[PDB]
């Protein structure tokens, strides 16, 4: 057992990529300012107003253009994938795949017997293909941030895609820049940049997406009610979800949105994650035992940093020692199979704590 | 405005039937003994051990027979209906319907194109048909407690059913008696007797149900991954869910389970809800402007009490005045259309508060 000196440790040891650091004062709202909301009806004003705070707050944070709406429903982003397969894809989609999450949505669409066989454009993990389109598709899909690899991809409507742009922003939303007008469905869950819990999905949708949802419904295509985007939309527009949402999840999410907006909005959040990730990547470049997994700097995520270790330094051992010292969730994505650490740098994470983390890793490695 | 005197008011004004009263000392564990779990990985030991506590606690509380397992996944009970339609029903089901929730499961199954047309046995709201079977079905389904009507139904395996017994216990589980051996899937969500949040479903499953899930999967039947019972089972057995669960929901749930077990278990909870409900129904009988909606006393739920009001006393006005005085969520189920109050009496609700509620109703009614 190596005991890392307290003086060099981060103030908060949570570097997980979802769930992720929930701020002390943010968690504290659950027993204070939100306490009276708990255990009260999602069909009555107090909880509906909370949903309204979330919707209005996200609309401000993301500078929603006219006609865009915040849609929400239980289940988390994984549920949204199945909902989108039923409800947003008409005939066929094109997917970019370059890691666990981008691949899994494509796979979900491939198996779903209500839509066509998707075009899948792949790259190796640590890279990404360019956003692109095809004449045969009506949805083009990729991930803003591939949480498994630490790759961030530009969110721009490809030339000649006059198709809905459907973006998995689960780990990107709230920490990376975005022009929402380039998107038609920009979806996420609360447990990354929003510093809340899983079990709810949120989707910012364009008028084109909303009209598409309505059109697909009018074909008679079956969808299980729980995965129904039509039903989610009708409820969301009246500050509700189809079935009962978690009040804690909404409360923590509202507090984080308010904090982000109060600190200067998405531009502040992006500067923050830039500060943090600059510290991580500069350190990884400086040390001879580390290197960023992502070789193209233009793809290096500000919010999830994947740092490979050379052969003779065992990152698994480093992660274990960190964990035993209260510095947690630096293990790489469980399926990736590399000698690597993965470090989250969502806005709740203090840039100084990322600096501290790197000093802790140096201290450990010197003593292996 | 009528200002109800403080001296006659309940200590806690939450009488909603889901979400429902969350005890303060329970909520306070989020900021103390559970605080370090927030924002940490559901694929690492601390949160897995929390899931383990929920599963083992439920196994104790419900006296699970050998081979029964606690299965869980995101989405709430409404998600479970769709998962069950895909994953538990082989060819055909029989449903009893007698209110919103029992009817909604039947409707979900009717529309699902992967199974046959269900047999539906109906009664008027306020009543229920008898648990029963049919030679052409392989699942028999009803609700332990129909939250929309205040009707509780026996949970017994019908004679000749030698079919899976699939019971919607969303508002019954934890507050009504049950012999789990009479069931094959006894499912619920945390926001009623368990005094936690929505967005998670739990299902106690028999060996027969688990083998059925496996057999259906082995046919190659497609299911969206989010609604996959095979996947939920695989994860549940290793203290996980398919996708990211809410730590607050699990933490509040675990605390409530521990509280129930520590007080004497299900037997204690049932004595408590009997005490509360006796106060409500006896009051309703005593007053000339009230009567229990459910005329058969054997169907009168111990946990959700529906009290009709005579024409000349406007229960809507009563509910509004109660609400304005902090006594909330006594409105009847939004779709039922009756001059009625609906009062929840789950174990977190103190019996003396139900008595206080009745005194508050009398005080208001005398001044209308
Ligand atoms: C990019 C991405 N997409 C989808 C998911 C699935 O999220 P959830 O667990 O909320 O379903 C995740 C994992 O959290 C993710 O990082
Ligand atoms: C008996 C019953 N079944 C199903 C549901 C659906 O529950 P959820 O909102 O968790 O999907 C409810 C409503 O909460 C209910 O009372």
UniProtKB/Swiss-Prot annotation, chains A, B:
GO BP terms in the entry: glycine biosynthetic process, by transamination of glyoxylate; L-serine biosynthetic process; pyridoxine biosynthetic process
Any one GO cellular component localisation term in the record: plasma membrane
InterPro entries (UniProt xref): Aminotrans_V_dom, Pser_aminoTfrase, Pser_aminoTfrase_mycobac, PyrdxlP-dep_Trfase, PyrdxlP-dep_Trfase_major, PyrdxlP-dep_Trfase_small
Compartments, as annotated in UniProt: Cytoplasm
Protein name as it appears in the record: Phosphoserine aminotransferase
Residues the entry annotates as binding pyridoxal 5'-phosphate: 77-78, 101, 147, 168, 191, 243-244
EC main group: transferase
Principal location class: cytoplasm
Example of a GO MF term: alanine-glyoxylate transaminase activity
UniProt subunit comment: Homodimer.
Catalysed reactions, as listed in the record: O-phospho-L-serine + 2-oxoglutarate = 3-phosphooxypyruvate + L-glutamate; 4-(phosphooxy)-L-threonine + 2-oxoglutarate = (R)-3-hydroxy-2-oxo-4-phosphooxybutanoate + L-glutamate
